[PDB]
Design a protein around this nucleic acid. Structure first.
Lengths: 313, 62, 128, 94, 357, 339, 89, 64, 128
RNA sequence: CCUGCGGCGGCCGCAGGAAGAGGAACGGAGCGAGUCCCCGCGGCGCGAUUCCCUGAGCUGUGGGACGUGCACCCAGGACUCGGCUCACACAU
């Protein structure tokens, strides 16, 4: 890590709007392309050295987008694994097709009085057979084949806002704006643990390729907490950040689990195992994403005002 | 068919064989439209007629 | 309307002072080939099963009961239509002298341009 | 399976993981709810869920059994119903 | 506010009530002591069920098919039991045709023999002096004449011609003729008297008795549209503008108003006894045709006038009229002839022989 | 100047006369100048329902502000719908059944899940739905009419649509918006709703909101005043102005309120266009309603006869003994007792 | 033979005569019309005009005298072929 | 809530989804205000409303 | 004037042209600390129990029944009050994007000199 | 004897009916009970450190957590009664 070379930037499609910003960026699980969301509720897909980058695909969505996710496998070895899932404010769950860009399926979820409820946080299973999404107090568990209205409700704190699974054992975790982490079994639905923690509302979780470590952020809490599961104890260490707004500030690892990267609300970019800063630019830096094969990185930009897109080495 | 007409001051038919009026408007045919015993387009007629207030229900009663 | 005041009460939307002349010439350059449809008996049976094209209607036929069912036939498959002032001249532009009430132009053989030009302009005319 | 079947109607656009159909049955018999719909040659594909539209030419829509898609079916196909499960138009009128 | 008691006399003014019950207060009065019952509506405001059971369309005639066909079509559309028409028209002419539906049928015979009007076109082979000739010599055929179908006698009241065009050699005429007349053969004679040789080209019938074209004339699409509308929307609005009630044809006659208990007898076979009479229209003479009606405004039958008005003001018992053609059903009102002052006496095995009919 | 007189006594001058003599009494008064003790015991309010609470709750609150015992309403709004609601106090409760069944009007908003071509795809899918429809109620399937529709405004960036539906009592507008989606090929839901008509009373005139039903009562209580309360409650004789009128004269009035079928010697004026077997309103000489009753003679019979029944009472309004018993005392019926 | 009617004009193939008997009596269909010279010059196709005095056209039997007669000359018929005008009214 | 309106020349409600009129004045909500069955501020409302002549009473009388 | 002609009928007294500006700046320099009140739910409950503060009101709220009870609540305890033209801007000067109707500024922490300036000036505005 | 329907101006067959044109209270109302129709994941206020919140989560013309009390789930129509009460009225 020695001041990563500046290889490319978009900063051209986000220009026709009075105010506009980005809300993350994600590599495909193979290497092919990158997924972007912005403040006009439009998804865009980019493909992998001196000129402005243009995207191959645009998806229009309507009101406002609470999430998105690449299909669990997405190996381009075979065609029918090119998915991207999406959620919005009134609408149901959509599943878009990543080559032509026309809708393939929907996954609506229904109340106890037959009105519709939107989802706040979705995530696929390891084997990619199910779809979990989180609601005001519960999670709903659709199967991937046989779409439509058919849930399998599991009950419980507050709005569940992000889900993530364990690499090597049956387990999953759910974070909420009620400032708590729930740990449940993959198949039954029993809370196996319930741990306290932050000051603000949780906004991201992430696991380590060991199956032991565990990392999590927050909404206005200016710190980042580490955990462990062999020891059911409480935070083992703690790190530093800065967050003065109510947005997701992403962070990630790299494939072998040696380096961690963060974002921040001044512009700078942490690194740990503590190492280096390497400013991306001058506005807020939300969303930071690392390629699964070669050394590469991607960073987004933007904040409310009461605007670029970069790739480094 | 040859018969033509045009209406007078008191709204009664004046028959003639010409093609314009003694002022210059055109003349309408006398005979009515052809008919077949299996039509199927009755909804199309009422839908249109309603929209411009030309249907018989919406005109003044005798 | 260059001496045209004898209209039906169901004759919206109309054509421009020239929008029609353009259509007249398109109909002419379509007549050179066998790419047109004449009379209610033929438009009615063609536009039932497939048959995508574009329809012009006369604007002074009486009694209206001869072709009142056409506009809705159009709406149910989403084609366009438009009314031209006289039937004396539509009959002429077709290549006869007995007037008619309805004609249908379709996508051409080769050049397609004026055809495509008048298609996409007729689709933005004030709602009837 | 049923003894025989009768003509219910034709296919049209799909809509959110389900297919809409026009009903063209003899007289104006209207179906039961959650009544199995069969294919041409005695195969089962799903059930009836919703009934709507005007009184004579009303539409309906199907909920598919597993293993089917909204892409398998082609324009104006034909689906067939068990004839015992129809109801006369009369018990609806005054 | 309050409404005040006064002392002066009270009055009606009924010069706009629909159909028969119009200018009702000008009929001379006889009595007013009776009991009215609660059976049978006003003639207009009936349910849609029996509003078409008794009714008539003033249809306009299409141009190709023949009258029998037309009528069978209408009878299939409205789903009724039987229909008949006003008088046969030929497959190439158009005009009025008064189609009666299922109970108006009872007065088709009185329709078929009623004065009629026509308009048409004569085509001449060879040329003429001019239209002033045809003008002068169509006056020649006025009155009683001979004819046989193309040797019966007919008559013709009035005719005129309109305007002529010498170049195509065609002419126009309007005419008012008796029932049954052959209009086609009139042109042949017209030519022969002309000395050129004529033929019939166009013909249209203006007026068929009292129903003209200026009146509410309805085309043939309408009788399908309105039926469909009532069928799918439950709207009876359209169905009423086409079909009218039979009481509308019976309105240039004279009236005789009967009591609600002496009605279900006349609808079996019995005479018009003098007692059962409430009002009567002045201007009746002997041996005429009149119509007898209920208090409500329905029609009972048409009949023959025996006593003039002058007699019927002053009597003890009589017989007022005798039936000609009955319209109403039989058991509309209940039957109540077995009772009363005299008939009770007569049944109690008692007979002065005050008088017999 | 007869066009200006109030409810049920307006344009009276255009009626057929049967006599013009009687002798006026003392009792009763107009409904307008009726006293506050009972001008509230026989009245209705035209409420503009608020958003969050139920509809068996709003009436429960009006039954505790104005101290009474019985109330009823014209229809039923689910919580989170607004618009016209008609409530009746005490006596007026007996006219509930003919308000629960009249013509309604709504205004809505629907969200299409995916995108369509334009404004016209929705205008047509609306046009398609009219006349008797099927509707399964959220029990058996049933049929209900619809008289009209329209498309007011569509917005494509959010996919929202506004419409106006004239219909029959007992439909459902939550189910209509499922269907308007299900055929257009995309999907749909109902977002907002608002009734805008019930029976004769619109939202265009005579409308008030609960912060007056609670304020007028306060004012009257504390400063002994009524001018702010007789602007918020209205008398029964305003919601019958489309029925057919028959005027009975004095000394008959207490008879009928005791239960005796109407009889032709007492009638004083009758209205043109009466038909057999149809509801009419029988009124006093001052404007008060006595009852609703079913005619038994056409309006032309009435111009001939001399006696006999001319209606039978369906349900009676007035208070049993308001007028004094003056019956059995006339040219006949006095000479029957001489026997 | 008695005087039937007198020539008026020739309309295409046939002439026209005006029944000028003593008494208004009408003939039968297809009666052979003579001159005073006993020979049939035609017969009678039809009659028209008022019931009081009526016109009737004669068809010619043979090609004969297409244009020989004057425009009021006299023709004849046997007295068997008549009938009283009363029977028609 | 999204429903908005504004008055016509004839004085009837025109419903719309926007935030201004054709000319440019604002549009007010369609729905009414909240209500609670035990308020306590009935006195305060009357005398302010009185002060500017817009209480129910000082407006012209309807035509019954 | 200044493109704001959409006012309630109960919006006296007003704040002119420079008065509004001065209060705006005071509001922000108050927002820096925990020394403000927003929303009807909070003003209504604060001013029933002492709280010697200052109230500004928006001047285009509809329907008026949402905050009509406050002016009289003020008279009965003798505080001052005043209406500003728009609510879009009051919401802004607070540091948000969504508008509000009523704001209450109070005596400052650092004993601001200006806080005493417009307190003492708005107390001589023509009686409403 | 008369009317209605049908068959080929008239005849024939079938069906309905024996005609004096009644009765100025005969047959109600208002309540009560029973059977059918209709048809508490909410709502309102108080206390607590300014009880927290201008979210990216709808919302400050409110959202939420913790202790707290309070109010609501009817009213109508039909049928039956082997119920109570008042009347049994042609309108001077």
């Amino acid at each position: 890590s020695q001041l990563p070379r500046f290889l490319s930037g978009s900063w051209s499609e986000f220009s026709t709007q009075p105010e506009n910003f980005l809300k993350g960026c994600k590599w495909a699980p193979d290497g092919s392309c990158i997924l972007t969301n912005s403040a006009d509720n439009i998804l865009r897909i980019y493909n992998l050295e001196y000129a402005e980058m243009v995207p191959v695909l645009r998806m229009v969505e309507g009101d406002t987008i609470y999430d998105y996710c690449w299909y669990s496998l997405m190996s381009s070895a075979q065609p029918d694994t090119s998915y991207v899932a999406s959620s919005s404010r009134e609408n149901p769950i959509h599943i878009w097709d990543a080559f032509t860009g026309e809708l393939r399926a929907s996954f609506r979820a229904y109340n106890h009085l037959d009105e519709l409820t939107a989802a706040h946080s979705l995530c696929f299973s390891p084997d990619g057979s199910q779809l979990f999404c989180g609601f005001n107090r519960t999670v709903r568990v659709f199967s991937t084949a046989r779409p439509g209205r058919d849930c399998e409700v599991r009950a419980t704190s507050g709005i569940i806002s992000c889900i993530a699974f364990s690499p090597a054992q049956p387990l999953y975790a759910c974070g909420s704006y009620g400032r708590s982490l729930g740990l449940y079994a993959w198949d039954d639905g029993s809370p196996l643990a319930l741990l306290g923690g932050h000051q603000g509302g949780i906004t991201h979780l992430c696991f380590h390729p060991d199956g032991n470590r565990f990392f999590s952020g927050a909404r206005k809490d200016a710190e980042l907490l580490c955990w462990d599961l062999r020891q059911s104890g409480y935070p083992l260490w703690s790190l530093g950040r800065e967050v003065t707004t109510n947005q997701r500030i992403y962070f990630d690892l790299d494939p072998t689990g040696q380096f961690l990267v963060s974002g921040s609300t001044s512009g700078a970019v942490s690194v740990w195992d503590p190492v280096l800063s390497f400013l991306p630019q001058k506005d807020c830096t939300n969303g930071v994403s690392l390629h699964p094969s070669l050394p590469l990185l991607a960073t987004a930009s933007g904040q409310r005002v009461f605007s670029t897109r970069h790739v480094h080495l | 068919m040859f018969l033509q007409y045009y209406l007078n001051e008191q709204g009664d038919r004046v028959y003639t064989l010409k093609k314009f009026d003694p002022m210059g408007q055109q003349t309408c045919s006398a005979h009515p439209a052809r008919f077949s015993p299996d039509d199927k387009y009755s909804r199309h007629r009422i839908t249109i007629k309603k929209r411009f207030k030309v249907l018989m229900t919406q005109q003044p009663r005798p | 309307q260059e001496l045209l005041v004898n209209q039906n009460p169901i004759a919206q939307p109309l054509a421009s002072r020239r929008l029609t002349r353009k259509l007249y010439k398109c109909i002419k350059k379509a007549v050179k080939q066998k790419q047109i449809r004449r009379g209610v008996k033929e438009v009615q049976k063609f536009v039932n099963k497939g048959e995508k094209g574009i329809m012009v209607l006369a604007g002074d036929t009486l009694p209206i009961e001869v072709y009142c069912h056409l506009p809705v036939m159009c709406e149910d498959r989403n084609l366009p239509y438009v009314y031209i002032p006289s039937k004396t001249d539509l009959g002429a532009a077709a290549g006869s002298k007995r007037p008619t009430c309805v004609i249908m132009v379709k996508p051409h053989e080769e050049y397609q341009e004026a055809y495509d030009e008048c298609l996409e302009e007729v689709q933005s005319l004030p709602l009837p | 399976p049923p003894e025989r079947v009768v003509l219910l109607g034709e296919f049209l656009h799909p809509c959110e993981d389900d297919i809409v159909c026009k009903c063209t049955t003899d007289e104006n018999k209207v179906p039961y709810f959650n009544a199995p719909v069969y294919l041409e040659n005695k195969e089962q594909i799903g059930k009836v869920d919703e009934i709507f539209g005007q009184l004579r030419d009303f539409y309906f829509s199907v909920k598919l059994s597993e293993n089917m898609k909204a892409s398998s079916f082609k324009k104006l196909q034909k689906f067939y119903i068990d004839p015992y499960k129809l109801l006369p138009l009369q018990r609806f009128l005054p | 506010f309050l409404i005040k008691p006064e002392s002066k006399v009270a009055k009606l003014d009924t010069s706009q009530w629909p159909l028969l019950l119009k200018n009702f207060d000008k009929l001379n009065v006889r009595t007013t002591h009776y009991t009215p019952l609660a059976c049978g509506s006003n003639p207009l405001k009936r349910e849609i069920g029996d509003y078409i059971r008794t009714g008539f369309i003033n249809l306009d005639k299409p141009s190709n098919p023949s009258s029998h066909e037309v009528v069978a079509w209408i009878r299939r559309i409205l789903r009724v039991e039987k229909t008949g028409h006003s008088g046969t028209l030929d497959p190439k002419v158009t005009g009025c045709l008064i189609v009666c539906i299922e109970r108006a049928t009872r007065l088709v015979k009185s329709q078929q023999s009623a004065g009629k009007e026509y308009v048409g076109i004569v085509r001449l082979h060879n040329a003429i002096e001019g239209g002033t000739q045809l003008s002068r010599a169509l006056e020649t055929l006025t009155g009683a004449l001979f004819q046989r179908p193309p040797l019966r006698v007919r008559t013709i009241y009035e005719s005129k011609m309109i305007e002529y065009d010498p170049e195509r050699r065609l002419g126009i005429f309007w005419v008012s003729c008796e029932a049954g007349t052959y209009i086609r053969t009139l042109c042949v004679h017209l030519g022969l008297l002309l000395g050129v040789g004529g033929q019939m080209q166009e013909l249209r019938r203006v007026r068929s008795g009292v129903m003209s074209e200026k009146d509410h004339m309805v085309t043939m699409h309408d009788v399908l549209d309105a039926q469909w509308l009532y069928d799918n929307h439950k709207d009876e609005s359209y169905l009423r503008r086409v079909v009218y009630p039979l009481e509308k044809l019976l309105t240039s006659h004279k009236r005789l108003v009967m009591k609600d208990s002496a009605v279900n007898a006349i609808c079996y076979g019995a005479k018009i006894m003098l007692p059962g009479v409430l009002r009567y229209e002045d201007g009746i003479e002997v041996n005429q045709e009149i119509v007898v009606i209920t208090t409500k405004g329905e029609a009972i039958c048409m009949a023959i006038a025996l006593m003039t008005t002058a007699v019927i003001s002053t009597c003890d018992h009589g017989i007022v009229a005798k039936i000609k053609r009955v319209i109403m059903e039989r058991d509309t009102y209940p039957r109540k002839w077995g009772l009363g002052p005299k008939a009770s006496q007569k049944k109690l095995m008692i007979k002065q022989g005050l008088l017999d009919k």
